[PDB]
Amino acid sequence: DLEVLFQGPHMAFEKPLRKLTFADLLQATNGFHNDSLIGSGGFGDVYKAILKDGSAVAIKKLIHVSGQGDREFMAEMETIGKIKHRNLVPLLGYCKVGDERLLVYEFMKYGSLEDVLHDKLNWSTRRKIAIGSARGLAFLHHNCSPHIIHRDMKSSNVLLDENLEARVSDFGMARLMSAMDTHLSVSTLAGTPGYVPPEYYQSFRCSTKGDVYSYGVVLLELLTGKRPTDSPDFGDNNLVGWVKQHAKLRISDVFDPELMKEDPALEIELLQHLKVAVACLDDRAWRRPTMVQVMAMFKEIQA
Amino acid sequence: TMEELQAAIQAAIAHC
Ligand SMILES: Nc1ncnc2c1ncn2[C@@H]1O[C@H](COP(=O)(O)OP(=O)(O)NP(=O)(O)O)[C@@H](O)[C@H]1O
């Protein structure tokens, strides 16, 4: 059953990035007030707000370091700033004045997957989330030239909009890799504990298969309902480690009680989705599927 | 390890 993978908005007809006034963002957030904050500390603070036109936005205010360039601002502007797809967060505008660098996303109703999955998601709903987030990443790797390597896929960087559909976000660490290359050399260790592929700890090189590892983790989170690290059941392990040792024993215990409880006849489909996740988490990068294959695994499971 | 795990999961669907 023949599927055309990418058929999202044609850029040429898209609303261009609006350059915004700092004063407007300043006012709309009440002087960047604390009760407007929705995200704190990581490379900036993110504030919920409604613009002059009624549009609900999230405004990321990037922290300016003395004697430094705006690398993270540019990373988003040169990547998510240039593309649109239903499984990517919409970057609506930006503010660049003096040393201020702000990024204005369309506001995604339910905030991040992490926020939701821990503090209502049924299977059908979670299935849709894994699929859409796979499509978003696939777009970055396969439908962009040069390719985009996200470098920080995690459940907090998967937003959920009105109809609970997945939107990959936070492009601050993203990098462009020529299609002729297989990897990009980076200067430092970047990524979130729980999600870093093994090879990133051996060599300062990122690649699309790097992103694919991190995706696998996000999929575990959906299947298990666990955080990627620091859960009491884990012990000396992470989510990845835990699922690994745990499975020789009783595989289906790994699954989230809430999904199992909803229906005992989805225990098989759940198991099949775990195969995808495990493939993505292969220690050998070359053996991991591309995100295009992951999507194909998903749609095979259904039929 | 991983492929052992993959086998385990295949048993599980079969062992349903
Ligand atoms: N467009 C948006 N719509 C709704 N919520 C958003 C949006 N953008 C960011 N957020 C929220 O802000 C949080 C994350 O902001 P962001 O800094 O982009 O990712 P973060 O990586 O998890 N920072 P950190 O946790 O320190 O690594 C998420 O939990 C969301 O709740």
Separation between Cα atoms, residue A288 and residue A196, nearest integer Å = 14
- Structure token digits, residue A254: 């790994």
Separation between Cα atoms, residue A251 and residue A275, nearest integer Å = 11
Which sequence spans correspond to the domains of chain A? 1-303
Experimental method: X-ray
| Residue A178 CB neighbours (<10 A) | 10
Is residue A64 within 8 A of residue A100, CB to CB? The reply is yes
Angstrom resolution of this structure: 2.2
Whole-angstrom distance between the N-terminal and C-terminal Cα of chain A? Answer: 10
Separation between Cα atoms, residue A219 and residue A124, nearest integer Å = 14
Residues on A contacting B at a C-beta cutoff of 8 Å: 244, 247-248, 251-252, 267-268, 271-272, 274-275, 278-279, 281-283
Is residue A188 within 8 A of residue A215, CB to CB? The reply is no
Residue A170 Cβ contacting ligand 1 at under 6 Å: yes
| CA dihedral sign, ordered A171, A173, A178, A181 | negative
Chain B environment of A251 (Cβ under 8 Å)? 8-9, 12
Is residue A144 within 8 A of residue A249, CB to CB? The reply is no
Q: Searching chain B, which residue's CA lies closest to the CA of residue A253?
A: B12
Separation between Cα atoms, residue A72 and residue A78, nearest integer Å = 10
Of the candidates A190, A220, A215, the residue with the CA atom closest to the CA atom of residue A204: A190
| β-bridge partners, A46 | A39, A60
Is residue A224 within 8 A of residue A273, CB to CB? The reply is no
Separation between Cα atoms, residue A171 and residue A168, nearest integer Å = 9
Is residue A111 within 8 A of residue A119, CB to CB? The reply is no
Is residue A86 within 8 A of residue A128, CB to CB? The reply is no
Q: Is A235 left (phi over 0), alpha (psi -120 to 50) or beta?
A: left
Chain B environment of A267 (Cβ under 8 Å)? 16
Cβ separation A248–B13 shorter than 8 A: no
Residue with tokens 């058929």: A7
What are the two backbone dihedrals, phi and then psi, of residue A112, each rounded to the nearest 5 degrees?
-95, 155
Strands A91-97 and A18-19, bridge-based pairing: parallel
User: Residue B12, SS3?
Assistant: helix
Name every residue whose Cβ is closer than 8 Å to that of residue A218 and which is 6 or more positions away in sequence. A113, A130, A133, A153, A154, A155, A158, A195
Q: Is A256 left (phi over 0), alpha (psi -120 to 50) or beta?
A: beta
Residue with tokens 């960087």: A157
- From the candidates A99, A152, A236, A253, which is the catalytic residue? A152
Judge whether A24 counts as a catalytic residue: no
Angle at A89 between CA A85 and CA A52, to 5 degrees: 115
Residue with tokens 């430094």: A68
User: Residue B16, SS3?
Assistant: coil
From B4, B9, B16, residue closest to A275, measured CB to CB: B9
Is residue A223 within 8 A of residue A254, CB to CB? The reply is yes
What SS3 string covers chain A? CCCCCCCCCCHHHCCCCEECCHHHHHHHCCCCCHHHEEECCCCEEEEEEECCCCCEEEEEEECCCCCCCCHHHHHHHCCHHHCCCCCECCEEEEEEECCEEEEEEECCCCCEHHHHHHCCCCHHHHHHHHHHHHHHHHHHHHCCCCEEECCCCCCCCEEECCCCCEEECCCCCCEEECCCCCCEECCCCCCCCCCCCHHHHCCCEECHHHHHHHHHHHHHHHHHCCCCCCCCCCCCCCHHHHHHHHHHHHHHHCCCHHHHHHCHHHHHHHHHHHHHHHHHCCCCHHHCCCHHHHHHHHHHHHC
Rounded to an integer, what is the distance from CA A38 to the centroid of its chain? Answer: 17
Cα–Cα separations (whole angstroms), residue A175 to A78, A141, A289: 9, 11, 21
Separation between Cα atoms, residue A194 and residue A181, nearest integer Å = 27
